[PDB]
Design a protein around this nucleic acid. Structure first.
Lengths: 38, 204, 36, 176, 50, 121
RNA sequence: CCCAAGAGUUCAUAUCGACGGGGGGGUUUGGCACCUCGAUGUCGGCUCGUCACAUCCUGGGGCUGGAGAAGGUCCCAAGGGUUGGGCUGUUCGCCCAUUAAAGUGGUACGCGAGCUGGGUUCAGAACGUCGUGAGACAGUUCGGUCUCUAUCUACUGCGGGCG
RNA sequence: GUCCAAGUCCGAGAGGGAAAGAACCCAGACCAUCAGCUAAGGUCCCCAAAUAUAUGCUAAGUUGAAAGAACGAGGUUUGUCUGCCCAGACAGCUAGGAUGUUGGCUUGGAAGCAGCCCAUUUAAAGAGCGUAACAGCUCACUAGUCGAGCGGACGAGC
């Protein structure tokens, strides 16, 4: 999981979600596309 | 689950399987229950044990009246234990039998006082420099006690020279070897704080 | 020999759900840790 | 809103009562309780009408949340949910002694679990295939929690595939 | 300059409440005086004892 | 009790007489090395025929110490000179002879090769 | 940190990333000259510590161009620990042997009414070079006095009075 | 910081406010008084005066002193334009997804997917993954289900 200041969908199956007031990019099929910090 | 004893001396025995073992003799005489503090009048469950009886001359009228509600009379060492194993009432006696062979105890005692000791013997500081390479008068000096204008004060807790003395220390699980009950012996393995003929609190 | 981890659930009074309490014990001492 | 404006018609045989904040559902598999706070739920006798008062970004979600919770409790205590785990790998063993599961994985010990009396527990390890454990309960939340804390004992590796997985539920695999 | 007024007896202090998430996000600082001795409590922990 | 900058006598037929201690292996800030402890040494005599050269760096074990060392039974051993035996790159002794007696504490540390060819133990 | 031409067998973001841009910190060299020239003692080392985390080890995880073991990168975390020598006045640096590791910094580049004076800026002498000369050198070498009885506060200990 | 020009203030200036600040805001102190009205700034308590009224926003303790970026986001309120819609809007579920043809050039191999360049049946069919090339999965599209909103662009406030 990488920490970036500007998260964006690195694919078409990624999902942007908000956990505890923090943006995450989750992709269960390709777990190397995980980001946070919004 | 608790007793009072007197440190007799120190010797060395041999285990049943070779090796030598240093040991300390604790004449843990029969203690007597003086007052049982319950959870209704005081606020916690405990009971006092008295160890060594006094005379009718040195004792106070208050102490005489306090121990008259009990069996044996005014004691030299009275200390309050907590969380015993068997529910017992006033006047009962506990000689040595509360300990077994192979158990662990937490002897507590008052160390012997060293008096006013410097930092080298109290905290373990080492010198200021060498002994001859220009050393003038600071062979046993503390050195510096703080920094410059920030914070412009000596921090609380700075290790300096003071009365080393003897406080209460626990020995943390000494192993019991001999629990002879006829003559109160309680031979344990290890050291014990304090000089000879000093009172110690043996917590089981 | 070999130890045995016994995981038993209980109704915690701090919330009301089903928590999990595991502990490494002897293979023949798991019966006394599951009845309590 | 859209999922909350739907009826919760009951498969007759199960009753639902409401209290001062607590809703209870009694069927053929034990009572189930739930606590609602910002929704008005009324049982007419056949359908259960749950509605909201304001649209303030929180009640609009609590409406559907409590509707789905009540529907789940019903389609539970009435019928009940069930799930299946499957142990994949060499030397993996699973045994059942009632409400007590015994798992033998590649660890240096075994794992015995005293599953709560509110969840059934069956096992199938017939000859050589992968041992299949099956749980069944009326509480879907507790069922899923038990299944999760059983699966967490050994996560499915991506290279081979060994691990406590569900039946079906294809895994992400790599080359290695 | 005179101690006028009354004596107040609050009789339900255990039943007081805070508005937002202050019971979980209110901190009390209790520096002791020793280097590195700044202790921080919480509104939830402080009401657990007295 | 042998530490850095300590001169020892090599007791074997490997081809050295006197050696100098460089390090006491077995942890950070380790002070001394009694019998049975491993040390790093540098040869300083290198007998003419020899099998080792003067200036090489090797590893050895302390065999005899002048400091009285205590056992579990309560007894003590105290030799008259600080001696050591060189070791191979692995945990093995180089050579086939050992001069003078050795300590029994060298047996609890699996130095059977060194203890099985000494005059006295 | 932002964009991503590429490099990565193909695949920008496992890993690195040019051409450009936006900020945080005040530990380096600077800019200003604002308090001190009826004196704020300057480098290095010793003793004593204390603080921040921008974490070297131990602790918990995500991804992998992760078969396992060893790795690479990122995230959370300051409780404890973080070696001894050769050379040099050295900070720094190189080397030798270990260790789980041999962290980065601040506190008047911490600390000289705590220590040393090895270096630097005192008076002597000599070398290279400049100057006709007296003399000088961010050139080198040998030698060369470090003052004070603790009042207030700040610390480490021990007592008397009163409540 | 420094050097000029047009003003004000300190210098040589008391008093009130910003918690404490020579210059910032108000305001130019002849004395005395246990009198009143106001400026800046404020009216829950420390500390004089509104726990005053009317309307809306914020959920971050943002904020209640001053002061922040390139670049992200399905936080929320609000104005205009704007397409799809009971002849059935978006999502979900089920099924179909062809033929000339494996289009032509090149390539040992290019068959919709190394690179370049229409027709027929229909409710509809287009000359991403992967395979040495095929194959196969998926997508564009259409058919049935429930039946009411589904979205974009330009702004403005927090």
């Amino acid at each position: 999981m990488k920490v970036r200041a500007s998260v964006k969908k690195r694919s078409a199956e990624c999902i942007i979600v908000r956990r505890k007031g923090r943006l995450y990019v989750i992709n269960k099929k390709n777990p190397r596309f995980k980001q946070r910090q919004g | 689950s608790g007793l009072i004893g007197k440190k007799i001396g120190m010797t060395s025995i041999f285990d049943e399987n070779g090796k030598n073992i240093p040991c300390t003799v604790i004449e843990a005489g029969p203690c007597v229950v003086t007052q049982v503090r319950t959870n209704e009048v005081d606020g916690y469950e405990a009971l006092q044990l008295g160890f060594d009886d006094k005379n009718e001359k040195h004792s106070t009228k208050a102490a005489l009246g306090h121990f008259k509600k009990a069996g044996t009379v005014a004691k030299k060492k009275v200390v309050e234990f907590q969380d015993f194993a068997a529910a017992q009432a006033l006047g009962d006696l506990i000689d040595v039998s509360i300990f077994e062979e192979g158990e662990f105890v937490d002897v507590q005692g008052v160390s012997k006082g060293k008096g006013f000791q410097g930092v080298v013997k109290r905290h373990g500081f080492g010198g200021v420099g060498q002994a001859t390479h220009g050393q003038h008068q600071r062979l046993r000096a503390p050195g510096s006690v703080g920094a410059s204008s920030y914070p412009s004060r000596v921090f609380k807790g700075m290790r300096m020279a003071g009365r080393m003395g003897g406080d209460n220390v626990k020995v943390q699980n000494l192993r019991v070897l001999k629990v002879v009950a006829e003559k109160n012996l309680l031979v344990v393995k290890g050291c014990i704080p304090g000089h000879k003929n000093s009172y110690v609190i043996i917590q089981k | 020999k070999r130890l045995s981890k016994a995981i038993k659930m209980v109704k915690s009074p701090k919330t009301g759900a089903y928590i999990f309490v595991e502990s490494i014990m002897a293979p023949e001492l798991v019966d006394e840790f599951l009845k309590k | 809103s859209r999922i909350g404006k739907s009826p919760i018609v009951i498969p007759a045989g199960v009753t639902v009562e409401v209290k001062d904040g607590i809703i209870t559902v009694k069927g053929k598999k034990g009572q189930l309780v739930q606590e609602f706070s910002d929704v008005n739920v009324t049982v007419e006798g056949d359908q259960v009408l749950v509605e909201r008062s304001s649209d303030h970004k929180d009640h609009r979600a609590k409406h559907g949340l409590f509707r789905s919770l009540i529907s789940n409790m019903v389609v539970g205590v009435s019928e009940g949910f069930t799930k299946e785990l499957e142990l994949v790998g060499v030397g993996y063993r699973a045994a059942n002694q009632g409400n007590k599961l015994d798992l033998a994985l590649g660890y240096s010990h075994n794992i015995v679990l005293e599953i709560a009396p509110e969840v059934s527990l069956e096992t199938i390890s017939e000859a050589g295939a992968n041992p299949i454990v099956k749980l069944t309960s009326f509480d879907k939340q507790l069922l899923g929690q038990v299944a999760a804390k059983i699966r967490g004992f050994r996560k499915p590796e991506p290279y081979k595939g060994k691990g406590v997985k569900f039946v079906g539920e294809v895994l992400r695999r790599k080359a290695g | 300059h005179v101690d006028c007024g009354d004596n107040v007896i609050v009789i339900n202090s255990e039943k007081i409440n805070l508005t937002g998430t202050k019971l979980n996000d209110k901190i009390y600082m209790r520096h002791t005086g020793y280097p590195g001795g700044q202790r921080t409590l919480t509104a939830k922990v402080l009401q657990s004892k007295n | 009790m042998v530490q850095q900058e300590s001169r020892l006598k090599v007791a074997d037929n490997t081809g050295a007489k006197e050696v100098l201690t460089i390090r006491v292996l077995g942890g950070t800030k380790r002070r001394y090395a009694s019998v049975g402890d491993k040390i790093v040494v540098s040869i300083k005599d290198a007998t003419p025929n020899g099998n080792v050269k003067k200036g090489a760096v090797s590893t050895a074990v302390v065999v005899r110490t002048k400091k009285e060392v205590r056992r579990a039974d309560g007894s003590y051993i105290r030799f008259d000179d600080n001696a050591c035996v060189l070791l191979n790159a692995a945990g093995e002794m180089r050579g086939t002879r050992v001069f003078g007696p050795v300590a029994r504490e060298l047996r609890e540390k699996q130095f059977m090769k060194i203890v099985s060819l000494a005059p006295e133990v």
